[PDB]
Structures are given as structure tokens and as C-alpha cells.
Amino acid sequence: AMKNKVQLITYADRLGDGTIKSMTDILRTRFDGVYDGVHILPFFTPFDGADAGFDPIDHTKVDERLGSWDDVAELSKTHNIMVDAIVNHMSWESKQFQDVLAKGEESEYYPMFLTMSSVFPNGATEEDLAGIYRPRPGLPFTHYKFAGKTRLVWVSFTPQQVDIDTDSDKGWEYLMSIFDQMAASHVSYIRLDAVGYGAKEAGTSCFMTPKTFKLISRLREEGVKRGLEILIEVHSYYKKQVEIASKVDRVYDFALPPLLLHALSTGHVEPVAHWTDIRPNNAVTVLDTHDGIGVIDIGSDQLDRSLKGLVPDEDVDNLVNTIHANTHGESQAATGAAASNLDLYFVNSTYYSALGCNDQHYIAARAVQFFLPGVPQVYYVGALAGKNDMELLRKTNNGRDINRHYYSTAEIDENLKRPVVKALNALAKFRNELDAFDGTFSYTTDDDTSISFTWRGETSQATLTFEPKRGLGVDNTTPVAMLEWEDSAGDHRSDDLIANPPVVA
Where does sucrose bind? Predict the structure, then answer.
């Protein structure tokens, strides 16, 4: 099972000097006892193509500019490592796809890649194609020539990411090569990227269908067989996440991030209480990720608007406008059609910027994250309470880059001096050291105004009380989270997690 300790999510090259070795040095020298594990975002060949690692030419080969598998082995001595298995697609410059461009149906890899005809051998109606779930408008096809013949190749994301047939012999062999490589390279945990898209079937949405369930359970068993805990990435209507969670080791809690933005901007905690009541507890919790903020993950089902979310859709709309206001238009320049994006409706902003850089709100959001059942992950920009990177956004025109700043070691050290960053480091140490979090969880609530989360352990207990109504407003300085706990040294309390961070005896 996944260790119950806070993890860092990072690019190997955007934290430190630009290599896995430097990333490792930063973790060990500056976050000892803070981050006990790390999800290294894709570091395979190449890391800087069409989609920042997620279009691998060779998924089993570390980009030689970043380091080697030996570096990953070294890191594993001090940190449990999560990596991606990119199971849905690969680069069009992969040897496999290039072979198909060259030889078409004579290629041994022809069956490995999905085309329109793969899935719709007798053609498709408009309803058939319109019903395919998409993260942005436009059909999931682009033109490639197979031995000179124009073909419509299935592409869920960029046209450079060609989708594999996960039910083909060649496709499956490729996926198992990834699992074998990770098992042999001292990786602990696997993230199944975009796995909800991995199964296609004519007349279905091709997203989180019964065929997808079969794929997910098959991949999970291949993980367990190799000692790899499987986390699936699924941004979906919330009920689908609750459903699928009983079939895998971990799901993300993608509802919490926008639920907390809603709570912190309106004062309403009832939706957080309801989510606490029903959520899968085999979770990996986040606020920020390397993608945009999935505000729609708490909204109505996009393929059936009558299935309502955790908040009314009008509240999602309000949330989006609030982020835009809090970032003074920054998120508007990065979000949706305003920049290049895979997800039309995710909001591109750092989480700290989305809160208008309010320290009390931000530390409160992390405290709530750490107190809900699940293994917590902190994205590296969030680990340094990072603001929107408008210069990088202007340079690349890639919307998500607003939240993918390159941190030199010098900039890391500068940010480590900030009270809010010191507070997060201390909070994560606390979350790693108190045995209460390995015990039994309970919560109480005061009708939409207050919620208190309690853990009771073998030798400790802790209660976090969250009351955003106390400090509404981007310039508010009033604490909205309070912490009480018992350890070796008796009862303790902090009423201001920034001014008085908790330390376990």
C-alpha cells in the first residue's frame, strides 16, 4: 500500500538545476521530512515535445538530458517514487507509429493504433461521433498518411499523441513493457494517465464505460502482480469517480480543489461536508496539479446535464468568475480558448493565485486537504506558494504553463523564507509525524458554517476546525482554520497556522 506521507509532484527539470539528480538534491536538502515521496512527471524521451512529456517517443528511456534510470534508483533509497504509465497514446514520432506511416497495413504495428475505421468499421452516424466524450470541441481525429493513403487517426489530445488500441496484442505488449520497466527501476507507484479514455467502442461515449472498467481492472492486476500500487487519473462527473474507486488502489480527489475555492470565497462548507460524507477514502488528495483546475469536476454530468454536481452549475460559473477576478485577468489570458489547451473548461491558474495570494486561505486549504482521508500530494508550484507565471505563458502560449514555472535553486531558497511556505513545510511534517492520521477519522459540522475533522490514533489525536466565514475577502488576514492536538507532551493548539505552525513532540 501507499505510505501515508505527503508527496511532492514535480517536473525533474523545473525544480533545481534541471536534472533528476538536482531535483533529488533539492528534495533531500530542503524538504527532508516534508515530502517523503515524489511523483516525477514524465521524464522519458522526450520531455519537451508536444505535451511536456506526455507524448513519449520512447516511454522506457529516460530523456538523456534529464538523467538515467540509475538516478531514479538512487532517489528510491530515500523516497518512494510515483511515475506515469501513459496508457492511452504515444508520440507520432515513436518507432511504432513511424513504421505504420511507412508501411501501412503491412506494418506489424498497424493493429496497435486506432483509426476511425478501427472503431467504426461500417461507418458512423453524426450521433455516433457527436457522442464521443471530449475535453474540448472538435472530433478526436487527424490526418496521417499510411504508406501514402490518407487515414483518420484517433487522437484524444494533441494530434501528435496518437491513441493506441489497448485491446490489441501489440498495444498490450507495449503497455506491459512500460510496467516492466517501472517495476525494474525501483518505482513504487504508477499513475494511469488519461485512463478513462483508454477504451473505444462504437455507439458509446468511449469514456469511463463498462469496456473502460475492464481495461482499468486488467491494468490494476498487472500493477499488483509487479508490486506497483495503481492510481488512476479520471476527471469525471463525481459519481463516476465514487463508483470506480472501489476497483482500484487509489483515485484522485479532484472534487476537493474547487470545493475549497468555493468554500473560501463564499463561506459555504455544506458541500465540503457532503463530499466528506460520500467520497472514496482510498484517495490521493491534491489542491493543484500540473494541469488546470478542474472546476467542472464538481459540476453536472457533461453528457447528461440533468445529473447535478456537488454544487449547482451556477456556483461553478461563479467560481470561475471568482478565480478570474482574484487573478486580475491572469487566469482569463491562460484559460480555455485564450491559449493552447487540451481542456476547454479547466481554469489555468496556480492555486495560490486562484485564492488571490491569501496566505490564511491557502494554508487552511492545505490543512483541510491533509485532514481528509487519503495520501496527500503537493504540486511543486504550490509547495513554494507560487504565483501565476505570465512571462512563461507569453513565451509558449500554452495555457497550463501559467502554473509550470521553472524554479532555480536560488528562487527555491528565496521562497523558503516566506512565512506561508514555512507554514506549509511545518504542516506537512506534522501530517507525516502524528500517528493520529493512521487511525480513525470522524467529522462534525455546524450547518454550512463550520466543519471539524478529527483523527484519533494510538498515541495522539488531532482536530482541524474550518470556518471560512471568519475571513472572507482576498485581503483578509483572519485565520479560518484552527488546530488542536494531543501528543507525547499533552494538549496543544494553534489558532493561526502561519504565525504558529504545529510541531509534534
Answer: 89, 191-193, 233, 290-291, 343-346, 400
